[PDB]
Amino acid sequence: MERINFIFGIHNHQPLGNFGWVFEEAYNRSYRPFMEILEEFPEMKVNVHFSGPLLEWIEENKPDYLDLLRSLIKRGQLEIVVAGFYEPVLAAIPKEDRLVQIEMLKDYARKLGYDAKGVWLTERVWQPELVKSLREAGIEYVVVDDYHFMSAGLSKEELFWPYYTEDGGEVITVFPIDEKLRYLIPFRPVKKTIEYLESLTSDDPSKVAVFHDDGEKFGVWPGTYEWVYEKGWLREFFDAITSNEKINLMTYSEYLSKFTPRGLVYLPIASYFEMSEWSLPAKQAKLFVEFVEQLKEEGKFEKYRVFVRGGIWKNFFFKYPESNFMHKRMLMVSKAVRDNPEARKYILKAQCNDAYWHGVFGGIYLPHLRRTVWENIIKAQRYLKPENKILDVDFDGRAEIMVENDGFIATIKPHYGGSIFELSSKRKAVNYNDVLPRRWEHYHEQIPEEIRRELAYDWQLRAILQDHFIKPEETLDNYRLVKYHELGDFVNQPYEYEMIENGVKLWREGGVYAEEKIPARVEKKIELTEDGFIAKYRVLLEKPYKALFGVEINLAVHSVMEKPEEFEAKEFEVNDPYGIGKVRIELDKAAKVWKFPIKTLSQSEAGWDFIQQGVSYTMLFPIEKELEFTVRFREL
Ligand SMILES: [Ca+2]
Numbered sequence: 001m002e003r004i005n006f007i008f009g010i011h012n013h014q015p016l017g018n019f020g021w022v023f024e025e026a027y028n029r030s031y032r033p034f035m036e037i038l039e040e041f042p043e044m045k046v047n048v049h050f051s052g053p054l055l056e057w058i059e060e061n062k063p064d065y066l067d068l069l070r071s072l073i074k075r076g077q078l079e080i081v082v083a084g085f086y087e088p089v090l091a092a093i094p095k096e097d098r099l100v101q102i103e104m105l106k107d108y109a110r111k112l113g114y115d116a117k118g119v120w121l122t123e124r125v126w127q128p129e130l131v132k133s134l135r136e137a138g139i140e141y142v143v144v145d146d147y148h149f150m151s152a153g154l155s156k157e158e159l160f161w162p163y164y165t166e167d168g169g170e171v172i173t174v175f176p177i178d179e180k181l182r183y184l185i186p187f188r189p190v191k192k193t194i195e196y197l198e199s200l201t202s203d204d205p206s207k208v209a210v211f212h213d214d215g216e217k218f219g220v221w222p223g224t225y226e227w228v229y230e231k232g233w234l235r236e237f238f239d240a241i242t243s244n245e246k247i248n249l250m251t252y253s254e255y256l257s258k259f260t261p262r263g264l265v266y267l268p269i270a271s272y273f274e275m276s277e278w279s280l281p282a283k284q285a286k287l288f289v290e291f292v293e294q295l296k297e298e299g300k301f302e303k304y305r306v307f308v309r310g311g312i313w314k315n316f317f318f319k320y321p322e323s324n325f326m327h328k329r330m331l332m333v334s335k336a337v338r339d340n341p342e343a344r345k346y347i348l349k350a351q352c353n354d355a356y357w358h359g360v361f362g363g364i365y366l367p368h369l370r371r372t373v374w375e376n377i378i379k380a381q382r383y384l385k386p387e388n389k390i391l392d393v394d395f396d397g398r399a400e401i402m403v404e405n406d407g408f409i410a411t412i413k414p415h416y417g418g419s420i421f422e423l424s425s426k427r428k429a430v431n432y433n434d435v436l437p438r439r440w441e442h443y444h445e446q447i448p449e450e451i452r453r454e455l456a457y458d459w460q461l462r463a464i465l466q467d468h469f470i471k472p473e474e475t476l477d478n479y480r481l482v483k484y485h486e487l488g489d490f491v492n493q494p495y496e497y498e499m500i501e502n503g504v505k506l507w508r509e510g511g512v513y514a515e516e517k518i519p520a521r522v523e524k525k526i527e528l529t530e531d532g533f534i535a536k537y538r539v540l541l542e543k544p545y546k547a548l549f550g551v552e553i554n555l556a557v558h559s560v561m562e563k564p565e566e567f568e569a570k571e572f573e574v575n576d577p578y579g580i581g582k583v584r585i586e587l588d589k590a591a592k593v594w595k596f597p598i599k600t601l602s603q604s605e606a607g608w609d610f611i612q613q614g615v616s617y618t619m620l621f622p623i624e625k626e627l628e629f630t631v632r633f634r635e636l
Contacts, residue, residue: 276310
């Protein structure tokens with residue numbers, strides 16, 4: 001009967017902030033061999049997308065590769081597919097930024113000798129209004145998953161054709177990635193794809209099956225290089241796929257030049273299926289996984305998958321407050337910097353998606369990806385005149401206080417212990433509080449014993465200047481892990497405040513609960529200094545009681561494999577060369593200092609990830625009725 005049309009595509013992306021060797025390995029393990037083997041089969045057509053940073057790393061290091069890509073473009077073997085230059089999730093960035101981001105990559109594709117008409121949707125996060133944006137960028141089609149169509153209401157059998165979708169009276173074509181093909185290519189034996197595709201043929205000559213996935217699958221992921229190249233899966237596939245008379249190879253643009261989309265369809269906010277799991281808060285994700293697994297155990301997943309639903313990507317901002325804070329801070333700067341091309345480039349770089357969420361790849365859990373985002377938010381903001389302001393930054397209904405001078409930007413949350421949640425250095429372009437609290441992930445609970453004994457989950461968010469109250473006999477380990485007895489209620493409770501020149505005055509009428517409620521009061525005077533900040537404390541208990549007042553300061557120390565340690569100190573220094581650099585904490589009175597790394601257990605593509613997201617430093621001072629001291633943070 002009719003031949004089945006087949007579209008083959010890959011997506012190559014490397015996030016800003018990745019280690020140098022990671023790009024190098026991805027190139028020698030996948031980007032290069034894949035294209036070298038592609039050149040051996042003149043009839044093979046591939047639809048490829050390269051993220052901007054990747055193309056820049058390649059220009060600087062592997063120039064010859066680009067001539068190879070130009071050559072393959074010229075012989076009709078490659079269609080260049082674009083997206084936002086720095087791989088941002090389009091739906092999560094200002095519409096104005098979407099245009100500039102896409103146009104930057106279209107300019108690059110143009111330099112390779114191709115007029116890009118298609119967009120690879122980053123993390124396939126779809127929102128109806130993206131039609132307007134893509135259309136203004138001159139994009140005629142976007143790639144999405146078959147799952148998006150199933151969520152709209154269509155069955156898999158009507159997903160072997162692209163469709164139109166509209167919004168604002170504007171339309172754009174949409175191609176669905178066949179989930180089956182993602183399963184088959186390239187990990188299942190070659191003949192399995194040939195068999196699956198041959199079975200799709202019909203009397204409709206426009207029918208088409210689409211495969212589009214991570215290029216990293218062809219060499220980078222563990223065990224794939226041996227499978228794809230050493231054992232020859234790719235050469236065997238290119239040979240079979242270009243010989244089969246029932247399978248017609250073509251690029252997206254080629255398909256559209258010969259067949260018109262099947263019809264009109266509307267899509268919901270969705271992503272590829274796997275994202276439904278991760279984008280859910282921990283507790284629900286576990287349930288979701290249970291449901292999905294219990295559907296396969298009862299062999300009824302296939303006929304009922306079209307009705308399974310989970311979370312949406314944007315809710316990572318709910319799951320991870322730190323990501324939300326980071327995101328809203330960048331939206332804030334993007335707007336204020338929109339008219340300054342130089343400053344704006346930094347904010348566009350900050351929109352690289354990877355550090356804002358967590359699925360299987362570390363993402364937000366990788367400190368180096370996170371500091372890169374902050375680094376860029378800070379550099380973009382440094383162009384603005386410093387100004388103090390009170391406003392709800394992360395939209396939780398409780399205004400933040402932003403104090404700033406020529407060298408720093410501090411964000412205080414009165415509602416949460418009157419602590420500093422952001423201490424950004426304009427000189428180092430780092431956020432000293434670029435840390436993450438320890439949380440349970442639905443995939444926890446197999447974890448080895450060594451890591452198990454070090455696992456602990458926080459109940460407190462982690463910031464700078466968090467006021468504690470503990471028993472004199474309390475131990476570090478108890479505190480290190482989350483066992484210790486917290487006597488005060490000032491860590492996660494609101495404080496009143498008063499604005500003062502160069503700072504803020506906060507105080508809280510709380511209490512010290514032990515055997516009875518001993519009402520207490522905490523007063524803290526925080527002022528910005530040219531090299532950090534100074535905080536003057538005054539703790540007062542209504543009635544005598546022997547305890548230890550503690551001021552905790554969390555820091556994004558990342559290159560200092562620190563370990564539990566306690567010592568007496570009036571002043572101490574921290575040296576984190578690859579992280580926050582050098583800083584010094586000065587007290588006007590010796591204190592007991594407890595120090596411990598904030599350890600997180602994370603899921604990755606290559607085993608567990610037990611990462612130090614920072615180090616907690618908490619100065620203890622004995623108190624019975626009255627207490628007074630000063631803590632000064634100094635940037636060196
Ligand atoms: Ca708020």
